[PDB]
Ligand SMILES: Cc1cc(=O)oc2cc(O[C@@H]3O[C@H](CO)[C@@H](O[C@@H]4O[C@H](CO)[C@@H](O[C@@H]5O[C@H](CO)[C@@H](O[C@@H]6O[C@H](CO)[C@@H](O)[C@H](O)[C@H]6O)[C@H](O)[C@H]5O)[C@H](O)[C@H]4O)[C@H](O)[C@H]3O)ccc12
Ligand SMILES: *[C@@H]1O[C@H](CO)[C@@H](O)[C@H](O)[C@H]1NC(C)=O
Ligand SMILES: *[C@@H]1O[C@H](CO)[C@@H](O)[C@H](O)[C@H]1NC(C)=O
Ligand SMILES: *[C@H]1O[C@H](CO)[C@@H](O)[C@H](O)[C@@H]1O
């Protein structure tokens with residue numbers, strides 16, 4: 597059954613998609629030998645989320661769901677995993693990940709069309725449970741980066757567009773998780789309450805959509821789930837890992853009118869702790885990282901629906917080239933792996949790093 601009550605990760609198996617599998621098999625594996633090559637084939641079988649970072653990625657979502665329908669007709673019990681990620685003036689506090697739509701060029705109307713396209717796909721594939729992460733680095737930017745003109749000027753559009761996404765994708769086979777930053781972003785004491793207030797306000801404003809299950813944390817970041825020692829870059833914070841973060845924010849959501857909110861947490865690049873970060877705010881292509889806890893609904897935690905791999909390891913965070921378009925200074929930092937291609941492009945040396953440092957190990 598595609599429909600569900602409670603945890604949408606229970607009773608299904610997340611599908612490992614062909615897009616990442618193709619990247620690994622055709623961009624990574626030909627450069628690897630022996631033990632590394634075998635291990636890499638195994639990484640491609642770990643389910644990670646497919647990012648709908650352009651409208652012309654929607655045909656690939658459809659293909660993925662088509663593959664799943666076939667597998668499920670043949671005895672499979674698989675679920676699709678996708679990231680909705682195409683807001684106008686996207687990624688407003690950074691320069692690396694600017695998208696195809698802008699508010700000044702009819703971006704809100706274009707975003708609504710993009711959402712409409714996704715809704716039609718989800719309607720077609722009502723037979724497949726569909727797990728969605730909604731708009732990484734959008735709402736979190738509204739909590740801490742209204743001092744960035746691009747974010748301030750986007751605030752109204754973000755809220756309109758996110759409302760449209762969560763209402764229009766509010767369907768019986770869907771579970772949505774709003775992106776909610778991470779321990780080192782919104783876990784800071786002064787950021788917790790405003791963050792919770794914003795998430796609960798989005799939820800209430802959308803008429804409390806039943807398909808809106810909760811929040812996604814650590815997306816495209818590196819924090820440990822439940823590491824027992826605070827890394828040096830966490831500066832003595834109470835909230836120094838994702839478990840502490842969700843247990844801090846969870847009750848605050850309930851306080852602000854969002855009860856029964858649950859979480860998923862990206863561990864795709866969290867295997868090696870501490871990481872190579874020299875400042876907690878360093879997010880771009882972080883050195884000394886590894887593949888982390890494998891996706892599982894067996895979390896041993898009251899609030900965590902599932903460990904997930906949202907950001908696909910190997911896919912770049914942003915270019916390190918000062919002369920290239922979409923260059924962000926964060927990607928040139930001592931703790932950012934050099935030289936890096938455009939955001940989303942394959943970054944072979946980074947994949948190798950993740951594989952070498954994987955915990956649990958693939959080798
Ligand atoms: C010292 C101190 C004190 C205090 O009180 O508060 C703070 C708060 C701090 O927070 C820091 O805030 C910054 C923002 O100012 C955060 O930076 C943001 O980090 C996120 C990751 O956590 C970055 O996300 C990137 O962009 C997107 C995902 O949204 C990804 O790009 C896409 O990847 C897809 C899959 O491969 C592709 O399909 C797509 O084509 C591609 O574009 C990218 O990989 C991801 O890295 C965001 O850009 C960035 O602004 C920081 O995390 C947080 O710690 C710090 C210190 C405090
Ligand atoms: C509430 O929803 C409306 C559309 O019904 C939208 O324009 C607005 O941005 C939302 N406000 C908040 C605070 O989420
Ligand atoms: C952390 O979580 C993992 C996965 O659930 C578990 O195996 C491990 O025992 C946990 N460690 C601690 C200290 O809670
Ligand atoms: C969705 O609806 C189906 C109806 O077949 C139920 O079996 C399931 O429990 C879920 O609520």
Ligand SMILES: *[C@H]1O[C@H](CO)[C@@H](O)[C@H](O)[C@@H]1O
Pocket residue numbers: 607608609610671672673674
């Ligand atoms: C998801 O589907 C897989 C295979 O279809 C199972 O191994 C798992 O138990 C879950 O039903």
Ligand SMILES: *[C@H]1O[C@H](CO)[C@@H](O)[C@H](O)[C@@H]1O
Pocket residue numbers: 614615618619622623
């Ligand atoms: C599978 O898909 C990947 C990602 O689009 C390509 O890099 C590869 O060539 C193959 O077509």
Ligand SMILES: *[C@H]1O[C@H](CO)[C@@H](O)[C@H](O)[C@@H]1O
Pocket residue numbers: 617618620621622636637638640641
């Ligand atoms: C790409 O294809 C290879 C085989 O060519 C697999 O081993 C890998 O898992 C991925 O699907």
Ligand SMILES: *[C@H]1O[C@H](CO)[C@@H](O)[C@H](O)[C@@H]1O
Pocket residue numbers: 618619621622623
């Ligand atoms: C990765 O992509 C290539 C095409 O560039 C395929 O031939 C290969 O089998 C894998 O899917």
Ligand SMILES: *[C@H]1O[C@H](CO)[C@@H](O)[C@H](O)[C@@H]1O
Pocket residue numbers: 623624626627628944
């Ligand atoms: C895989 O990586 C090697 C370097 O290890 C390259 O030479 C090759 O082109 C592919 O990117």
Ligand SMILES: *[C@H]1O[C@H](CO)[C@@H](O)[C@H](O)[C@@H]1O
Pocket residue numbers: 629630631633634635
């Ligand atoms: C890694 O190990 C596998 C065994 O599963 C071999 O098939 C391959 O040649 C590689 O060395």
